[PDB]
């Protein structure tokens, strides 16, 4: 489910380089791309999609996300990507209806 997302991300921003004024824009396109990736699966759920992108500048970081949800129907899926100067994180969250 997320492997096609990862291949989409490696297709979109593979080995590319930072430019800050379109960085958010890439995020938007990624969010739209992942939206189509959600719209291809269309499981009847409440979906949440989020991206993060950050320059490799030399500060150490740690990241994850949590909630307090109905544990059997609500879930999280993720893809981390990186290159020489950038880090990319995409997250999808399932809440049931």
């Amino acid at each position: 489910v997320d492997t096609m997302v990862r291949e989409s991300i490696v297709a979109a921003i593979g080995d590319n380089q930072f430019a800050h004024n379109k960085i958010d824009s890439w995020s938007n396109n990624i969010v739209e791309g992942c939206l189509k990736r959600l719209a291809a699966m269309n499981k009847p759920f409440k979906y949440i999609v989020t991206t993060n992108l950050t320059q490799k500048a030399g500060a150490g970081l740690h990241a994850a996300s949590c909630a307090r949800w109905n544990e059997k129907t609500d879930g999280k899926l993720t893809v981390q990507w990186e290159n020489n100067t950038m880090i990319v994180l995409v997250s999808v969250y399932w809440l049931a209806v």
């Binding site: 958010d24 995020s27 969010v31 959600l38 949440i48 989020t50 909630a67 969250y93 809440l95």
Partner: protein, 100 residues
């Protein structure tokens, strides 16, 4: 927002007199995230949930911004952002107030 103001109060109440530290930072950031979760999951919970993001950084003064593009169920999912800085710690919080 009242809740946002008290979440920023929680941010300071964590990080006052402090500086960002690589060695304290795993436990410090776990305490940060869990304390903001405990804030939003205290009184003020009415069959909701909160989805959380936290960023903590050292002070260098380059060009940095935040943005987030989502798709959500519209009437039940809301969002807010918080920024703060001090002598050595930048801290940003992103809160997603969603119906459980």
């Amino acid at each position: 927002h009242k809740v946002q103001a008290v979440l920023k109060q929680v941010l300071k109440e964590r990080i006052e007199k402090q500086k960002y530290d690589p060695v304290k930072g795993a436990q410090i950031s776990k305490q940060l995230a869990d304390d903001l979760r405990e804030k939003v999951k205290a009184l003020g919970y009415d069959r909701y949930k909160l989805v959380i993001q936290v960023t903590v950084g050292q002070k260098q003064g380059q060009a940095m911004r935040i943005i987030s593009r989502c798709l959500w169920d519209q009437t039940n999912d809301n969002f807010a952002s918080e920024y703060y800085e001090n002598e050595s710690m930048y801290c940003v919080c992103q809160v997603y107030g969603l119906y459980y």
